């Protein structure tokens, strides 16, 4: 004789259990039919240790891309926290949470020949920059570089092809930032500036490129809620 495998797995349970989001309470008993699965060591083929769900917000995303022309001085700025959290791929995995807390990591990639000998500056301004934003845009680029050189920044060299790694902390007067719909908190945590330091030249006898990535680390998602997040948007460039 063998086990009946239908009335050999039946058993009675209490009507109280929990699933980290839904808890049920009852006083009557239930009935269970628990059919267990097999070990199957040969059933694990596409198993790696990089792609996960907990470590999904640590995935780099391209947020910036520019082409530099000869003999020109320009300035360009974006919002790194707002652009990263608004990416269509990242927006899906933050959809039923209210608050977030993580550190920013930026990385720049440059490519130029030994015939270029140019230089550029990339600076970051922490929380509180929105108040002095209408006036900072009125300062000449040369005088802007004086203040940017005192803040967390990096220098881009075009004679070589090097530079760009920036670790930034979470600075805020609250414990977390609200990422739900209608929030403006992510767009007020920081700012990235990219302006010319020395104009690009060339030894003749005409365009360089640059790309910036971003991601997060030590991510903490809390406060489950039935609220939609900030409206997703593809990065402008």
């Amino acid at each position: 004789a063998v086990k009946d495998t239908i009335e050999g797995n039946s058993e009675t349970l209490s009507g109280t259990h929990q699933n980290e989001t839904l808890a049920l309470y009852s006083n009557v008993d239930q009935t269970a039919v628990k059919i267990m699965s097999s070990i199957d060591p040969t059933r694990a083929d596409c198993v790696s240790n990089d792609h996960e769900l907990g470590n999904f917000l640590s995935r780099p995303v391209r947020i910036m891309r520019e082409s530099i022309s000869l003999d020109e001085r320009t300035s360009t700025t974006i919002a790194p926290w707002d652009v990263y959290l608004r990416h269509p791929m990242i927006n899906k995995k933050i959809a039923n949470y209210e608050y977030l807390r993580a550190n920013l990591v930026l990385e720049v990639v440059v490519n130029g020949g030994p015939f270029f000998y140019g230089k550029m500056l990339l600076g970051y301004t922490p929380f509180g920059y929105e108040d002095s934003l209408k006036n900072f845009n009125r300062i000449p680029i040369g005088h802007q570089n004086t203040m940017l050189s005192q803040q967390p920044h990096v220098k881009i060299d075009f004679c070589e092809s090097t530079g760009g790694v920036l670790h930034l902390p979470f600075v805020y007067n609250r414990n977390y930032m609200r990422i739900s719909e209608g929030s403006g908190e992510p767009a007020s945590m920081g700012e990235l500036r990219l302006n010319t330091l020395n104009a690009l030249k060339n030894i003749s006898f005409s365009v360089a490129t640059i790309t910036v990535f971003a991601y997060l680390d030590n991510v903490e998602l809390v406060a489950p809620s039935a609220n939609d997040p900030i409206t997703a948007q593809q990065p402008e460039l």
Binding site: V154, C159, E160, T162, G163
Partner: protein, 54 residues
Amino acid sequence: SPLAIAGNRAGGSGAITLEPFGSDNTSPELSKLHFGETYDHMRVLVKGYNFYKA
């Protein structure tokens, strides 16, 4: 080329020291010669009163 990359980090930590102008020679008992006390801390300085906006 290594010497041109290491000398490009922020803060100027890859710059070449250049045998500075002269030497530094200050004695501990210079405050007793001039001004009596020191002014090296801004937290102490800000505890004095200043006139403002009658």
